Symmetry: D3
């Protein structure tokens, strides 16, 4: 049950990812064979739930690409449910301060380190108790990534980076650009300045920076600045744009 | 992406609705062709979730009937999710005061006007970013309808009616009659007085009054008093009652 | 595991039914409480499969109303599958002659009386072998109903009524009226003559006549002539027409 | 509408249960015929939601075994939704004190007794308004069981037992053992001591004690100590362990 | 209930299509807004059934793109079922001769023209009997497209082209190339020759030629030769190829 | 994409299986970790279809246990569909003679060897065209097992064994006992005699015998006789019987 994504990040190995919003275990398997280091199953902005996360985890399982899951909110209940179907790496939206970051971490750990609910007998996570000593091994293989997505989050970043158990800090540019007054224009220089400053600040604390960006040149820039988990595209967009451009080339 | 239901309410055009509790994209399509101005996908009291709301929206889409969604609660996370699958008109249950009404409005609006989370590449709402100016146009096409459903809510109605972004106020007679101590009996005179008083107060404010009522004579009365979005039946009831009546017209059979 | 629909046909007690085409286990439950003697899960003209039939059977189970299933065709493999999920009364479409009726019967019976495939350990039908002597009891609780739906079938009614194991013969007025040249108009005198003649003919053989008809006055006539399983409405129609009438009472009118 | 699990509880009848985590209406039906007094549909630790709870309730309905549902948390909204699809017995997780217990009770009762939202017309719970007088009878048929799963809850037990409407108090050994420093080892003597003490307090207060324990010898011990709703197995475990043993018997030794 | 795809083929307006194998009503909607003239819901080689076809038809409905459905075989029962959920254009696989083509036609028509079973009260196709005189109007709005996919079928093309109610003839290049001994790869001179001669012959008969090909240069060539329904890509391929190229630009490789 | 089950049978290595009729990708995963050599997804007597077969194959994929699928009938179209979602080993019910065996084989092979329809671009089987030279390599990794389940099939067994592409012959005791006149009692000596004779006959032709039997003593005997793919239990039975026995230990009375 070693979490290989977590190990790679701790080792400073950059991981290239794809964001999955098609909410299908079928297209998930198709994309699991595409060569990405990680895949993000989006429970916040795509029509996923615990049940569809489960089937996408099952589809992805035999492939080299590692799954990461975003809950719809920093909710300990939903987090519990996602961990039990086998989620080991979690990308938590809208973490605004160190207290919220701490609660995200505590939501993933069994007592006394946290408040994760115990139900190993019926969890896929323990393979229904086939994994020996699962309850003693689980906490150390959880990888908690928190999203900073507002000015308020930026103010609290130094404190957030001091929270033990926060393995990575992810910058959400859509939300950040909107909160900064540039909605839909994360490429704006003021937003970019905040993003670059944050990436360096995160890496400088010895934690892993991450980000999603559709511009491949920006993605390379962030990697140069020390980003360690970079999502470089989104499935819905890849499909829609490729389809539209094809139709257009035939005058449809 | 302009919200035609919102525009109709703003113009003062009465809209006749059916409540959908069958939680099926199939029956949703069947009912979408029946001639209603609006259909309510009930996420509060029917076994719906974000995924089933999506398929019902897809089913209804080619028809003129406009979808409205009731979330299970005034919860910004659920509202975010419903909006991203394409919900533009929301009927929020159990809005008790103007602070709650304001929170419902803010949940539907992107910053700085609200706290709606941004995920347009993934959203049916933006047609997966096919709408270039989606983020700039979205707020103005959201239609927030708040349900007042308790004695407490009725006391707060004047302040609720001043909340910018509340486009309509809907009276929920089942919850209201129960809160008033008349469960299952909205026909009661004290309940009817609170309802009529509320419709008139809403009307005078310039916002749209709405209500659900299965009694067609009451429905007509409410429309006469100025109600602008009136749901006049429920799919489960229509089906059950028509089926029960039909079986009964044949009754028990003689053994021969 | 007694087939009470079958027993009622044998008692001579007419059974009033509703046709289910909403293809939902939720609306199936709602309608199971509506007071019908039987409910037809339509696998031919509604978007059902073996899986949705199963969930509809589960939904209906605690209610008095008895389920009947129409497969999409007289196909022994599909029939095998529907029986294993627990179907005991079948309404087979487009049965054109005695050969086809015999094949429908044999599809429902274990050897040597037929060719039903054996898989009781897996089957809801046996409650996963919880029911003792299931394999020895099952054949006799099957109720085979065959639809006659064309001029050819009507012509061949006498041979069909001689088939052992055919418990009832059901007239399908939509397909019949179309085949007769009156599509959409089963109320045509020529179609009604064929229907009434058939009902009497079936009644006389000792087998049960059945029919689906949305006109209530016609239904009462068919009952008067001896019909024993009469479906008197369709869920999709009841809902659609009720919704439409309601909207209209508030529209232009 | 009569809640027979609640009735049994009030009569002091010990009820033997099976925990369901397979999240399937198909295996639910198979297990509903197995002879258990009750079945726990786990909304907290199995991949269930309101919709799958509904289908499992429909599957279980015609059997004697009574359903109990664990919501994922003490959340009035989820509780409202679970009640409307027909849940009458709730096993609420992580109830830490008396205030939380009272809020669980209030979430199940209509005004003016509580805050349960009213939507009887489209609820399976009322059979779509086919149950009279549903709204007047519903509150009394709700059965609220609260789970005590931490040292804090154990400390607060005396006060929790004083909450009207709490019909039963359930000890969660997995969560309790972890909270006490023995994760994966509820067998441990000190955990056992805490469990046995709680059962006594509960029984002596006049409320029903409950527990889940897969070790049958410990189950029988808890029953002897006065526990009244005891879940003695988990479907996933029964299936996994049985399959593993079968495979191993055909492998080396 | 007017079948506009049929009307386009009859008018000689070339229709550009995309093949749908993702078997999802969600991606079907996303693709329905991409600007194609038609979309093929593949019930033969993708994990679809009558129920999933229905949901895809519903997702596609409000968009201009017209749905076409390939059943898994020329089976009148499956055809009956597909039609009742609202399919009006069928792409029937492995039609080998004129008799089989005629049987495909008859499966889509009510008596006396065919053997389609009558179930209009519960069919989406009639909008649950809201379309007045549906039973009298339905036949003329059915569009039957037959796939020729073997050397035998190619030999029988002249006779297949003489079958009334066959509105179009589609060449299946993967199956045809396999039958010709090229193991599913149609990019050989002799396969191309067979395809091109067939397109010309179909068009000269006054029927619509169709084809699926992922190579855009070949698609353009087939349009130049008179093909009227050309599918120019497959959803699974577009997605897989787009994703793999993207990973490869960051060094991430699956090859 | 090598079929390891097929290779095992060829090598004469016995494979222990579990029959899956719970029709769930969730329980399929749970049972995939249980230690079996193979798992039978039953499309004939459990409520499965191509779509549910697909999700069970996906669930099973990262485990050692190899999937086998039983179609509902020897139907080329259904076989085509099952193969495209990734099925490589088929257990075909009610194969009665050599013509039927030969047609099962042809249904699994691309031309010229068979009539399997070509749709590689959208098949999980080819992993959407990532498996190089899939169409050229697919035929040799297909494993065709035919079920003999009637007296007629028994009579025709020698010719069935003489059809190339038939990799294994499976005896279906429930159907066979019924056709023989002992419905529900496979244990009857006359059925057992037929079964044992068939097993030796299959082994002697060089091909792999298989059977399903829930009685573990009988299973061991069939293995001793040279059966090479033996299913020793059924998921639904395992679960129902274990649950019932548990309830009964606490007082449950029928
Ligand atoms: Ca510090
Ligand atoms: Ca514009
Ligand atoms: Ca009756
Ligand atoms: Ca000609
Ligand atoms: Ca070879
Ligand atoms: Co964000
Ligand atoms: Co209300
Ligand atoms: Co008919
Ligand atoms: Co617990
Ligand atoms: Co082809
Ligand atoms: Co068999």
């Amino acid at each position: 049950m070693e979490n290989s994504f977590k190990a790679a990040l701790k080792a400073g190995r950059p991981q290239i990812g794809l964001w999955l919003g098609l909410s299908s275990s079928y297209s998930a398997e198709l994309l699991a064979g595409a060569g990405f280091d990680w895949l993000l199953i989006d429970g916040e902005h795509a029509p996923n739930n615990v049940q569809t996360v489960l089937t996408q985890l099952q589809a992805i399982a035999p492939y080299p690409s590692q799954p990461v899951v975003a809950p719809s909110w920093n909710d300990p209940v939903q987090i519990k449910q996602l961990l039990d179907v086998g989620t080991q790496t979690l990308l938590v939206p809208m973490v605004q301060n160190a207290d919220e970051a701490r609660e995200a971490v505590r939501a993933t750990r069994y007592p006394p380190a946290g408040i994760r609910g115990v139900g190993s007998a019926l969890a896929r996570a323990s393979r229904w108790n086939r994994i020996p000593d699962y309850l003693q091994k689980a906490n150390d293989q959880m990888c908690v990534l928190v999203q900073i997505e507002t000015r308020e989050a930026m103010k609290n970043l130094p404190q957030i980076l001091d929270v033990e158990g926060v393995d990575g800090v992810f910058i959400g540019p859509a939300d950040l650009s909107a909160d900064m007054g540039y909605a839909g224009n994360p490429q704006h220089p003021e937003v970019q300045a905040a993003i670059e400053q944050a990436i360096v600040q995160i890496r400088e604390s010895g934690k892993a920076p991450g980000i999603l960006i559709a511009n491949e040149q920006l993605a390379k820039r962030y990697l140069e600045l020390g980003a360690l988990f970079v999502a470089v595209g989104v499935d819905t967009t890849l499909l829609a744009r490729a389809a539209e451009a094809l139709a257009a080339r035939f005058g449809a």
